[PDB]
Amino acid sequence: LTRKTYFTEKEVQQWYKGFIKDCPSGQLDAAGFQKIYKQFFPFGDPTKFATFVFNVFDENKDGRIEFSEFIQALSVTSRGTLDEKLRWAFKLYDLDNDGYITRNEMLDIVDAIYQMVGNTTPEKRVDRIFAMMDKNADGKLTLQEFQEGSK
Ligand SMILES: [Ca+2]
Ligand SMILES: [Ca+2]
Numbered sequence: 001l002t003r004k005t006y007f008t009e010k011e012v013q014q015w016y017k018g019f020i021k022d023c024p025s026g027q028l029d030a031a032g033f034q035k036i037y038k039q040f041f042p043f044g045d046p047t048k049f050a051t052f053v054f055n056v057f058d059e060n061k062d063g064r065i066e067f068s069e070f071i072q073a074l075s076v077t078s079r080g081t082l083d084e085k086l087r088w089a090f091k092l093y094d095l096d097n098d099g100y101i102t103r104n105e106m107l108d109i110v111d112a113i114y115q116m117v118g119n120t121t122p123e124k125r126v127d128r129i130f131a132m133m134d135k136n137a138d139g140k141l142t143l144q145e146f147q148e149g150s151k
């Protein structure tokens with residue numbers, strides 16, 4: 001009985017039917033996630049990125065994606081406003097969950113993105129956007145620095 005999500009509730013209904021359709025156990029864990037990413041990027045190694053994305057999906061950090069976490073992710077990512085979408089992206093970068101994005105963290109992401117695709121540089125690229133987004137130049141990005149930098 002969500003409705004705390006951009007879905008109608010003859011929409012939660014399909015998404016659940018689809019959920020137990022894909023994953024009948026009702027719990028897809030890191031391993032399953034990791035392999036479908038292997039299918040999603042068969043010209044690279046999605047392992048690093050697959051993990052960062054899985055970590056944002058699994059909000060209570062138990063190592064499983066329940067429906068609540070799956071259906072909220074979809075809502076935000078597919079239908080939420082730009083801020084809400086950027087807030088979700090922010091969590092992905094913020095690996096240690098301390099509320100900032102640092103240079104090596106963002107480098108890690110760019111490195112993950114670079115690794116997942118890479119046969120068909122991260123360093124110079126991150127310096128570019130961080131210098132761009134980091135207005136006060138403290139070496140950290142706040143959500144606000146990130147949201148505005150992106151827009
Ligand atoms: Ca969970
Ligand atoms: Ca951080």
Ligand SMILES: [Ca+2]
Pocket residue numbers: 134135136137138139140141142145
């Ligand atoms: Ca800053």
